[PDB]
Amino acid sequence: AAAAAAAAAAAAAVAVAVAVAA
Amino acid sequence: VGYDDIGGCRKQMAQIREMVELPLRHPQLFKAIGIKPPRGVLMYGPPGTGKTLMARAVANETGAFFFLINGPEVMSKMAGESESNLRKAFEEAEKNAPAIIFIDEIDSIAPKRDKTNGEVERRVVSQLLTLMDGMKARSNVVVIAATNRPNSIDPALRRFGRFDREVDIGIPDATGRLEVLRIHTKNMKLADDVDLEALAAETHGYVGADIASLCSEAAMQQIREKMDLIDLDEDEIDAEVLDSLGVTMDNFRFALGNSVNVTWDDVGGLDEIKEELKETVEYPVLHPDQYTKFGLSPSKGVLFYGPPGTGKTLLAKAVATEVSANFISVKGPELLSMWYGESESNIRDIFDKARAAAPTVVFLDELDSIAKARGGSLGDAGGASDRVVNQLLTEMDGMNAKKNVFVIGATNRPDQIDPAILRPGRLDQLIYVPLPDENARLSILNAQLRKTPLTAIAKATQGFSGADLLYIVQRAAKYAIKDYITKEHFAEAMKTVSDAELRRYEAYSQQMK
Amino acid sequence: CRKQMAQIREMVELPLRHPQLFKAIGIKPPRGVLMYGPPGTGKTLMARAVANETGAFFFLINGPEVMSKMAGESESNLRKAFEEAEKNAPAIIFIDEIDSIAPKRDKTNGEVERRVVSQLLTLMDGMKARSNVVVIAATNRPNSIDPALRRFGRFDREVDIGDATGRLEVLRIHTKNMKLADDVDLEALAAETHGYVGADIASLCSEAAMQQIREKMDLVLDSLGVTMDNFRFALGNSNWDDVGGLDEIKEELKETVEYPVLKGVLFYGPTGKTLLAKAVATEVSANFISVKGPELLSMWYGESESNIRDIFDKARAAAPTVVFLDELDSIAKARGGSLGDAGGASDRVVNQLLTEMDGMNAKKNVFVIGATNRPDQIDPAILRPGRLDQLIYVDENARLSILNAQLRKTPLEPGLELTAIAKATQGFSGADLLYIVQRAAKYAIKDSIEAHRQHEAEKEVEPEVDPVPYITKEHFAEAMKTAKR
Amino acid sequence: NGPEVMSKMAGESESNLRKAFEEAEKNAPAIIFIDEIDSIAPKRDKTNGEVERRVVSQLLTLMDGMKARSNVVVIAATNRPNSIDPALRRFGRFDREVDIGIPDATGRLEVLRIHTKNMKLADDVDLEALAAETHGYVG
Ligand SMILES: Nc1ncnc2c1ncn2[C@@H]1O[C@H](COP(=O)(O)OP(=O)(O)O)[C@@H](O)[C@H]1O
């Protein structure tokens, strides 16, 4: 007989940065 | 495939040859001296400089196993996969005989674990750290990595044991480039009337990997040039076509056509200035043996100043082309940014590029805009100007080696520059470019109309600039296209610089003297 | 595709018919050919013609026809195909839909895919001189390809396949196995069909057959014929003269454009500048790229010499081209001196434009077209000779022609003349004429809706299909009441 | 039923499809309707297991194999058409699509009449008005 399997690894996120204008 | 395919990287090739052959050819020697060598190399330099070729050549000439790993190739979005790939790669490499692993573009998988955000990259960095150095670190295996920017690597990776030595493979010089060119063309059949020395001198700013592309393009152009009228062997092969093959100068020139072309001929007048410039630019590179026996460095800086449209940038291009050096021309405002720390970053990047490919002529136009007097401005723009000026001061003459870089400034307001850029050792030479005289107008008319089908119009200028004469010539050419060059065009074109500027310039020239 | 066909024939004959000559020359770089371009150009047709013009082997491998599910079942299959193509004879391998087994190994997250692409790369790189095998690969998009596959050694020779005879041949091939008709002319179907490729002719034939079957069902096996009207209604149910006035100006512009291509220009005035730019882009037989004024610096990340830089790179890549710079004043604005963040951005944009416009030599046949209303705010550094010297200065007849072209596909009232509107409006423009026409149409639609509501109310307590099928003169006279300049 | 083609024993879905097609063929030129094909035909990007590949390939080869005397047709009904294995869309497998869209006002009136023709309607019913306010209603 066969069998199944579950897998959940990770994802990809987005960050936000701040700058300093002269 | 062999060491004979290596050109220009003499010292580095010999170094790597030693490090890989000594412990394989005569391990008993290292047992006698009682140490082990370092098993790790970090190649850094521009892309396409024989890194992979050198690695595979070393692997082939010394019986071993070569395993190639790509940076992005082994990276995986899924969890627990990248480090497993690295582990199995190292394991199978260790299963074979003495082997040489090669990691290409390692900086993509070594983000320093400092500014990185994701978790996979730091885990694979840790996996590399464990694989290279740990309990039972390695048993008779050599590891080589290749990168373009080596500073973006984990400091833990650049340590002894992991990567003991760090070889530098930069852009090859003239002799190395000639070696590479002859190495590639050796297989090709070369027709007569072609000289490799000139084709090596002309290809001054070529990294080395695209020399092969140049040769292939030249061969393709020749074969395409002898196929329009000759059949494509669609019926039977011929014997009169096999003979009389080989690339000529025209094919290589066309391939090179596929950083400006000036040969000291278009320039008219300014004889003494031309002589001084060629004198002070050529000896440092033409005959450096005389300098090194006299034990003294050469002067580097030059500064023109005067009215506009006189030929300053043209003179710079001509001197850059006379020598086989490169040429980086930038404008003043073209580098400024409204952000904080960006202008200085641009200056540093330009000078790092200049020093990385020597000899090099850097040309700064409108130096007044960029190197303004620090003095007192009490403003944010004042702060930015002061910072960029200081960056120029420390980059032209600071804690550097100053191997070979010729800085040439061209300005229009010589009074608006601080008395620290004009210090000898930065821009020691100050040479005023004046307006052309009657004989200079004869020379400029003769040199402008070289490939085209005069005293009367030379005496009818009375203090014009070369740009005006170029405008006259282009208008005449346009009317010729609309309609050989007729006299009526010049007659009708004659009909179609402030004195204050002249006064100021002469004032600064006399006060300077 | 005469030039592209000749190039492909040379690249498939010289490295396949005279290998000895290639070896004698000493260059063996030709091993991979790519074919990109818009869909429906004849890439599959060219591949079939190549395969049917040579007696060599033809091992076609599709994109998604390599995935199996077994451990390393795609790399082993690729290796087997390559070994068969190398063992049989010096031949060509056709890779259709290459956009499926090359996910760039950087955005993908699978495993088998990242192993196959590597297998294909190591199989294309592992071609020696004695193999004498070539590869041709077709793709739809020219951007979703791994740069490692396009490196020197695997894929270096790319073609951009951008006709009526082939369409007629395909039509006669498809319809030659059916009792179609006795009064049909496939030449008209091959000429009128423009964008069909491969399957569109088959779909047209199928729809014609279906319409023929439906025609002879509501009103018998041997009496069946797909007539010309069936194909006509299957095609119909499937898928410089517009600038009035300024005749001498447009003639001079066309002559100047033709002579240079046998650099730049700028328009200024009160008028139809965008109309003239559209007519040039339409009726010049050349490429055309148009951007807005402040739209070239809206890409961010130093758009100054980033968006404009990549625009100029795309322009120089597709030489010759026409760069329609709309609102040149808004972009240049005579940067001069501002001493601010906006001033710095404007100066950077101006410097990028100067360094990407003054660097155009006689090569690449570039041509920048600018347009403005107020020439006072244009930068004199860009109007200097040698960069952009032309100055095209931009009536009743032009207004009448614009009004007649705007009301082409419009049910106008027969009792209406547009000469009165042309004579009344003097300092108007095409935009104001369009606004007046739109106001008249809105008034007509309001009147029609009011009449329809009145008819519905009368029915709840019959006119024609439309109570006002055409726009009367009253609608125009009421729309011109609130018309400005 | 789409998700009902799997089985308990090792490798029985393929046999299930094979016997299904055999029964559909042997009896007559019948018509077979596969519901929720998306449940057993996802794009390769969304496939990680191995039984999915096996059953998909079995269905592909069954679809391709079509004798001239079979005279059997397949009816597919998926509400998620953008997540289907494109291999099924190739000519010879599934060429004719049927975009069953949202009806217009007349269609809504027709549906109203169809559904209301089996109930006691008061005299005041005016389905025409109802078929104008039910803007987005579908079926
Ligand atoms: N010194 C050299 N001698 C011969 N070929 C060279 C040399 N330097 C570079 N090349 C050529 O450069 C091309 C690409 O360079 P390579 O070292 O393979 O890659 P990369 O440095 O970009 O990782 C190869 O064709 C190699 O022949």
Ligand SMILES: Nc1ncnc2c1ncn2[C@@H]1O[C@H](COP(=O)(O)OP(=O)(O)O)[C@@H](O)[C@H]1O
């Ligand atoms: N001696 C010269 N020889 C050739 N061209 C010259 C000469 N002097 C001036 N010109 C022409 O006149 C203009 C000189 O301006 P340019 O070279 O841009 O220098 P500048 O930096 O002083 O503005 C150019 O068009 C150049 O071609």
